Amino acid sequence: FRKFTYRGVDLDQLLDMSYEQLMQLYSARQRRRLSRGLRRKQHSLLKRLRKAKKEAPPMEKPEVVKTHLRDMIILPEMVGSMVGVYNGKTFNQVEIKPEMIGHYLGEFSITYKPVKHGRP
Amino acid sequence: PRQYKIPDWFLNRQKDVKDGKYSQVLANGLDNKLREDLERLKKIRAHRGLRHFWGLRVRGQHTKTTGRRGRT
Amino acid sequence: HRIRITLTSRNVKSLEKVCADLIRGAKEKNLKVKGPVRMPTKTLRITTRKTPCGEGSKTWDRFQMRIHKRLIDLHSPSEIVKQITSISIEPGVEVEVTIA
Amino acid sequence: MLMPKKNRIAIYELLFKEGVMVAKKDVHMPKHPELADKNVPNLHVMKAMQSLKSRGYVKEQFAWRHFYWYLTNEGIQYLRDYLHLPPEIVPATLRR
Amino acid sequence: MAVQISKKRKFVADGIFKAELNEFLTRELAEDGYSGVEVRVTPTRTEIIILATRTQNVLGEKGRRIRELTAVVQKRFGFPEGSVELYAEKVATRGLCAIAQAESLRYKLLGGLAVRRACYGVLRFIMESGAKGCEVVVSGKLRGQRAKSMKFVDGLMIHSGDPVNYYVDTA
Amino acid sequence: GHQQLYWSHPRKFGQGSRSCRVCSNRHGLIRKYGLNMCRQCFRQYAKDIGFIKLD
RNA sequence: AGCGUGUGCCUACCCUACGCCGGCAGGCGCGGGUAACCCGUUGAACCCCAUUCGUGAUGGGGAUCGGGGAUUGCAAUUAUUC
RNA sequence: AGGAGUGGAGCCUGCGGCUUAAUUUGACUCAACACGGGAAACCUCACCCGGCCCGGACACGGACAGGAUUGACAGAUUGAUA
């Protein structure tokens, strides 16, 4: 019900914010990932999100975009996106919610199915 | 503890995910703050959160040989 | 004048006969000679499984290569050296002449 | 093997000026320890000279990571007409 | 020198150097009777002697092959131009050098000669050559599918102890 | 371009970067003393390099 | 204490003293060592001396797990390690 | 005669089993099971899902400079500015 707040700042204030203060906003592993820099193979994914987001009618959630990049940080721009994260066999569509900020896309694309020993 | 000149790196809850306030949590808030982050990782359907939902090792231990006691 | 000569060799006696050969030419020149400084030897240890595969009882090896080194330094100009250095040197011994 | 002809003419006369040239077996090597003046990708050079013995102009030998192309007497005559050089010159291994 | 590697690494390096020559020459000069090499140190000059049975057969036509071999060692190892030289000396009492007698035997069976007939011809030959005793063991598939092993031995021949290191040479 | 996915993945470290100088495999390699020779290719060349099974 | 090891043909990658910053991991400067030379007189633990605890799953034990901070790497989520 | 243990506990790791797109595989009394020097994030890698390339010499028949035949940023495609 209440607004989502990340360390004490709400969603709309994240998006209009540069990265130099976004590093010290959250975890050490993530800020070192951004302090080390991104790759053009990864920048090419971000533009594919805005390309998929402005092409969405305002009452429809945007188009599905697929990727093999399980090693991408959920930064507050990717909110509201249908990413087809690759498992290794298939692309499982998951919708980014604001609560997934600061994690990897691979975390929500399970690679194995859970085991159940009884009842074949 | 803050105004009593206690450093930030002593606190069991540093940089909270909601309020980001460096606080120490004490024995009643501790366990309720312990099922908030657990259920937060479950609603987002994170792999780390589902491992708690299933009762498995989450920090990436080999479950093939150990962890048998509660598992009948 | 204070020049240093290094004698490193894998074989001991082939070093010993060279470490004594430079002495034959230096007292030939009748000048003050430094005694052959015996340095502590270095042994190169390599232990590996005898087996190409990973089967059988676990047995190992003890491949070594004990290297020896001797130092002799002389108070002599350069031309007196390079006439002695070129006499009766065996391939197993490596000489290192240090002018300074 | 659609690699530039400017790389053939160079290596054949590199093969002529010296009776034999070495090349370590490494397809992921843009360079050469000997032919370091220009690009001349290594994976093209070995599979250029294997087209020399498939016809029968050179020899072969291996040294755990290395090729040795000894061109034959029938190979030097192939150099005189293919790169058009006079019959006066012979490789450095034919001159004492 | 340039990078100045340590004393431990250099002595290991020339061991790798001498190793790669022996194999390269064993794969190339065997049919001309290659029997090992030896390096002799000299400032800016490394002469390597190729001890071979047929010295006239390793020079080829007008000493060309020795010039063909000095070329590859000049490019493979990156030795400076005119820094290293090769020679071709005769193997004394070639009947005693084991690796000389194994490759000589290797070409008899490869000629199609009988496995028994070949073994006696090389075993008694090194007997008139003045040996103390020898053992020629030929394994592998013989007289069918299942592999057996002939072991043709004569004379005095020891196995254990330290003397095996310098009284016996194997091939 | 095909050359950007043929060797563009960095091989400046890891087991896929070093290889035996004889056996050319990536298992049992002796990187000590700068050998870069696998333990199996090392054994038959143990003595001509100069190592001795002394004691 | 005693075994060792240490800047790499390809090789892009060493072992570290000292001075500063930080609780820590670590970071920033400067130098030494291709090594009986510098790390390094290798100030290692155990042990020894002196406090606290007091037979209590206890200051025994440190599994599991939360939050945070670093380092290596193109990349760590199925937590690389710290 | 004894010492210290293992078997019990937690954890590490190897094997079987089960599970799985795949959970690569070798070895099963001594003489298999911290063994393949096997401490696998990529690589390794042999497995699985996909996706490029020919790095199919050589010889023989057509096609071919009136061109046989390589590479190429755009847009769509793709994971990838293959």
Coordinates of C-alpha atoms in Angstrom, one line a residue, chain B residues 12-56:
Chain B
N12 CA 23.5 -5.4 13.4
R13 CA 21.2 -3.4 11.0
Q14 CA 23.3 -1.0 8.9
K15 CA 21.7 0.9 6.0
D16 CA 18.1 -0.6 6.2
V17 CA 16.5 -1.3 2.9
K18 CA 13.4 0.8 3.7
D19 CA 14.6 3.7 5.9
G20 CA 18.4 3.3 5.6
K21 CA 18.8 4.2 9.2
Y22 CA 21.8 2.7 11.0
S23 CA 20.1 1.2 14.0
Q24 CA 20.6 -1.7 16.4
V25 CA 17.6 -4.1 16.7
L26 CA 16.9 -5.7 20.0
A27 CA 15.2 -9.1 20.6
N28 CA 11.7 -8.3 19.6
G29 CA 12.2 -6.1 16.5
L30 CA 15.0 -8.5 15.7
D31 CA 12.8 -11.5 14.8
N32 CA 10.1 -9.4 13.1
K33 CA 12.7 -7.6 11.1
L34 CA 13.9 -11.2 10.3
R35 CA 10.6 -12.3 8.6
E36 CA 10.3 -9.0 6.7
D37 CA 13.4 -9.4 4.6
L38 CA 12.6 -13.1 4.3
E39 CA 9.1 -12.4 2.9
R40 CA 10.4 -9.5 0.8
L41 CA 12.7 -11.9 -1.0
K42 CA 9.8 -14.3 -1.5
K43 CA 7.3 -11.8 -3.1
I44 CA 9.9 -10.8 -5.5
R45 CA 10.4 -14.5 -6.2
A46 CA 14.2 -14.3 -5.8
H47 CA 16.1 -17.6 -5.8
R48 CA 17.6 -16.7 -2.4
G49 CA 14.0 -16.2 -1.0
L50 CA 12.6 -19.4 -2.4
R51 CA 15.4 -21.4 -0.8
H52 CA 14.0 -20.3 2.6
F53 CA 10.5 -21.1 1.5
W54 CA 11.6 -24.7 0.8
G55 CA 13.8 -25.2 3.8
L56 CA 17.1 -25.5 2.0

